[model samples]
Target chain A: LEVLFQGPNEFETLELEHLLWVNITQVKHSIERAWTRELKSLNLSTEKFAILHELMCLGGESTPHTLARRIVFEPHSVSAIVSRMEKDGLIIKTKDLDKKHMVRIKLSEKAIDTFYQALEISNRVYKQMMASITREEKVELSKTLTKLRNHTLPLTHKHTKTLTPFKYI
Target chain B: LEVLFQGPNEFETLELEHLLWVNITQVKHSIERAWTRELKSLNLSTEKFAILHELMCLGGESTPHTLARRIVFEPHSVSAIVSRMEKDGLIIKTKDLDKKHMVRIKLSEKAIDTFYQALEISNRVYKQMMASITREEKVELSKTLTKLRNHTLPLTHKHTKTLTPFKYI
Candidate 1:
């Protein structure tokens, strides 16, 4: 099948590749925005949600370095995010028992409750939104997305060392 | 079939979701960082790239409101992005003939060159990265992503009225 807009110039028209890229980006943005909206009622930003979730999963406290590794963020960035979370009372920072310089990150009780409530909200929203899709479709889509993610992950990780412009504050 | 993490509190387990979310978010950050790195050589930011692109694709000058609509951004946000682009000598703002208060956005010659070069670089990088995927699989993945986008777009557009947080500025 002929793809639309495959021409070298804009005058040549729409190509399948171009359309596909646009669609993918648009969809990603849409999902992210929707998630942001749903999570807003809890007053938890996405980064905050991420940090709390990480702490809750660790089952205890972790240093900035460890949390950075778990979250795939730079140690410095992780430290900053942790600092904000700590200031907000979502987590507490203390020194690790075994490591003198490293700070252990532990969740506050409030954070734990927020995490659980967010999880329930997320599950309900996701379930309702995906209700139209069949179980088999969901499985297939998840598998395909995972495969794509695996393939792209290395490229992203490798480039992260050199690219600094997209760093989020 | 049993999934990897299917315990009674699976949905509530921050570990499973945190890992998945962080991995995905990291991948996204990496990709954008890579793009930003590529654009930095040209002294162009992603927001600048987007504005130039929208102008190039849509043809002619656009008012802030019109550009915002085309780019799926708020007028104020688009105005700020455009202001930066103008300061960078990428575009110029002029008064619209029909509306005295409306400003028309026009691309400078520098912006045209930047857009072309950036597009070439981005296309090369995208093609190189996606080369491993089979053509059929790419098409299928693209279609699936498009379907997901269709499902999520309305939610995002509706919620845009309230300006959800954590959006890329």
Candidate 2:
């Protein structure tokens, strides 16, 4: 990818910025492909696994609105996904006894089993991918990425309003 | 997002790995949205601008196959995009005089002008997003991201063959 630079000696700040962006996209694209493949073997997806993770964090059950907010997806999309998962027996949706319209979502027994398996596999995949970097590098990356994420949160909201609707993670 | 961690005292290695992955996605998502919005004002998309950048790097003209390879997009998709741009007058596609079957793609005068504008906007958007991090942090991020990207390239290929087909960037 570095070969994209026609003149190495003439590298400018903008070029370095472009390289960083390109490398960032490359890392995400590759890892996502690898991670998606690993999860698919267990009948899971990166997107589904994210919802499952949030379900566990929400104490094994949550409302669709809460889940939508947590996962940073639109309510309609989350609702559709939950419905599909329910039909597939991966999720259990029940009405609240106190509020007739309120529905609660939780993992089915099979989903509980799948989530733990997915978690273990996720750890292994990430660990394998990070083998080239040192522990110190991991810490450094975490710090830098956190800063970048936080810094861009406001900018994303500002820009998204003019483009499309989406939530910042 | 850290608030999702219910049991911080029991924060295992897997959780940290998940956090890192989440942060990476967040950074990419936010930056992409912001960048797209910035380019859209100029009637360009990140995707189209990327093609323009490649066209310039390839000495102002290239065949679909080479452009596809350089941009990591499938040739069919590249061809479709080129056709659209041709209709929009953003690109000029002509048959090579010597090789009748070969098509050459180059930016129209309008696209060249738009490309420079997009490039300038890209730099500004990236610079603003990176303002939270120091120069040293940027260097560290660049190194770690390159390592991660390189390490994941082979893994992505190995996994991609078993799943859907896509090129590693």
TM-score of each: 0.78, 0.76
Q: Which candidate number would show the highest DockQ if scored against the true structure?
A: 2
Query: Candidate 2 DockQ category?
Result: acceptable
DockQ of 2: 0.35
Q: Which residue pairs in model 2 clash with each other?
A: none
Put down candidate 2 lDDT per residue, B1-169, tens digits, no spaces: 5666455222122445566677687677778877887777777665677677777767678888677766643356668778878888989988999897898888888888887778877877888778888877887788888788768867745333221122122
Docking class of 1: acceptable
Deviating ranges (above 4 Å) for candidate 2: A1-13, A72-87, A92-103, A158-169, B1-15, B72-89, B92-103, B158-169
What lDDT score is found at residue B66 in candidate 1? 61
Across all candidates, the chain A TM-score values are: 0.73, 0.77
Question: Candidate 2 lDDT, tens digit per residue, A112-143?
Answer: 88888888889788888887888778877888
Compared with the true structure, what per-residue lDDT tens digits does model 1 show for residues A130-153? Answer: 555555555555555455455555
